[PDB]
Design a protein around this ligand. Structure first.
Ligand SMILES: *C(=N)c1ncc(F)c(N(CCOc2ccccc2)Cc2ccc3c(c2)OCO3)n1
Length: 216
């Protein structure tokens, strides 16, 4: 693979969003992966509606602001035949009745791929596909209060992840490998909304344990 990758530089990544006090990280991880895949397919980068996922993907297993899985979101978009734009269906940070309107659908998917559970497979996916949805163990104050540099937490689990985020690239410090992760905690958290998660450190915080992307 290339020694570093940053899909932001190629136009695949919308600005950092803020999930607020709703357990909708999964929805933001899923929209970020589908935003990348639709951009690779069409050349247009269009922010997608997490609210549509929060309100409408119960049949596929999601639980609104109580949590959900990116793969259940990709399954909803396939079963539904579409997903509305953020502009048509803006975020409210509370689960509400489903308001999906196919007129304003700007994305679709035909399933999803679960990446083998190892960092070399993750690297190959990020280099060949685009941004990849992943889950991490974010359940340490060291994560909550992360500001900059490479995130390493000696108590991180590779098995017990609790937060969905988006890997948009990977690289190494010029001073030590990292994954470049877009969070959904707004731009004031971490490095403009991003975190450098340790890479090639025994699948630190389980970043390669639940990685996937949608097919389009
Ligand atoms: C995100 N803000 C958030 N908040 C609460 C919460 F319970 C979760 N879950 C998803 C993030 O963690 C993972 C995603 C992918 C893989 C492994 C972990 C956990 C969760 C809660 C509720 C349901 C889930 C998952 O699926 C069935 O319903 N995220």
């Amino acid at each position: 693979a290339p020694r570093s990758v940053d899909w932001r530089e190629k136009g695949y990544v919308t600005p950092v969003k803020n999930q607020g006090q709703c357990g909708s990280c999964w929805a933001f991880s899923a929209t970020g992966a589908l935003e990348g895949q639709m951009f690779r397919k069409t050349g247009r980068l269009i922010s997608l509606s997490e609210q549509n996922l929060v309100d409408c993907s119960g049949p596929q297993g999601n639980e609104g602001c109580n949590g959900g899985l990116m793969d259940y979101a990709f399954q909803y978009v396939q079963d539904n035949g579409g997903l509305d734009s953020e502009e048509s269906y803006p975020y409210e940070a509370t689960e509400e009745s489903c308001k999906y309107n196919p007129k304003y659908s700007v994305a679709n998917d035909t399933g999803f791929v679960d990446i083998p559970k190892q960092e070399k497979a993750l690297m190959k996916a990020v280099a060949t596909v685009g941004p990849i949805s992943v889950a991490i163990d974010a359940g340490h104050e060291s994560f909550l209060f992360y500001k900059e540099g490479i995130y390493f937490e000696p108590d991180c689990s590779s098995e017990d992840m609790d937060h969905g985020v988006l890997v948009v690239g990977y690289g190494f410090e010029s001073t030590n490998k990292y994954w470049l992760v877009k969070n959904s905690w707004g731009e004031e958290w971490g490095m403009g909304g991003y975190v450098k998660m340790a890479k090639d450190r025994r699948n630190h915080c389980g970043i390669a344990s639940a990685a996937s992307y949608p097919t389009v």
